[PDB]
Structure 1
Amino acid sequence: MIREERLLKVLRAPHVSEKASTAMEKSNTIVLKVAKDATKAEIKAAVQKLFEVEVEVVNTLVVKGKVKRHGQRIGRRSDWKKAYVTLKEGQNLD
């Protein structure tokens, strides 16, 4: 049982990319940016409540931040957690 408030905080964004699109189309799997602390179960819960859609399974991974250079000064982008969430057969997501 995850708290409503917690759930709302978990899910950061949808991730747009070719791969993501492919996943959505073929495998019925949505690619989300989620909180770095968000566990799989929590993510699933969030998905179910907040998008109103049955979840088969969630795979997560941590994306490491790229090191960049703004002019002369070096600086690193933040790490962030990506989640492939596979929706059950016949579940169409808006």
Structure 2
Amino acid sequence: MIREERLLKVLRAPHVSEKASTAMEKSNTIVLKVAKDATKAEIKAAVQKLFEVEVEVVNTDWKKAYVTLKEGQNL
């Protein structure tokens, strides 16, 4: 099985910007860079495992994803 290391490779880096900060503090969403393909299912699974958090939904040259967390958040 190679789903594991695939999840370790879809995330690339987090995006930092005033819109990103505003989204995090208001809507509890974190925006981060992802792989070129980085389908929503893979992004959701990767965030679950690596950050051990719960995500409401993910909506997505480079690709960025606005990962939405539930009420409980860590980082």
Q: TM-score range by the shorter chain?
A: over 0.9
- In the alignment, structure 2 segments of 5+ residues that lack a partner are none
Distance 1:17 1:57, change over 3 A: same
Q: How many corresponding residue pairs? A: 75
Report the Cα offset of residue 55 of structure 1.
Answer: 0.7
Q: Look up the match of 1:13.
A: 13
- Aligned-residue CA RMSD in angstroms? 1.5
> Cα gap change, 1:2/1:22 in structure 2, threshold over 3 Å: closer, same or farther?
farther
Scaled by the length of structure 1, the TM-score of the pair is: 0.76
Superposed displacement of residue 91, structure 1: 1.6
Greater strand proportion? 1
TM-score (norm 2): 0.94
Deviation of 1:21 (Å): 0.4
Larger Rg: 1
Runs of 4+ that moved beyond 4 A = none
Q: Which one has the bigger helix percentage?
A: 2
SS of 1:26's equivalent in the other structure is helix
Deviations 1:6-30 (A, max 9, x none): 0000000000000000111110000
Specify every segment of 5 or more residues in structure 1 that has no aligned partner in the other structure, as ranges.
Answer: 61-78
Identity between Structure 1 and Structure 2 (%): 100
SS of corresponding position for 2:43: helix
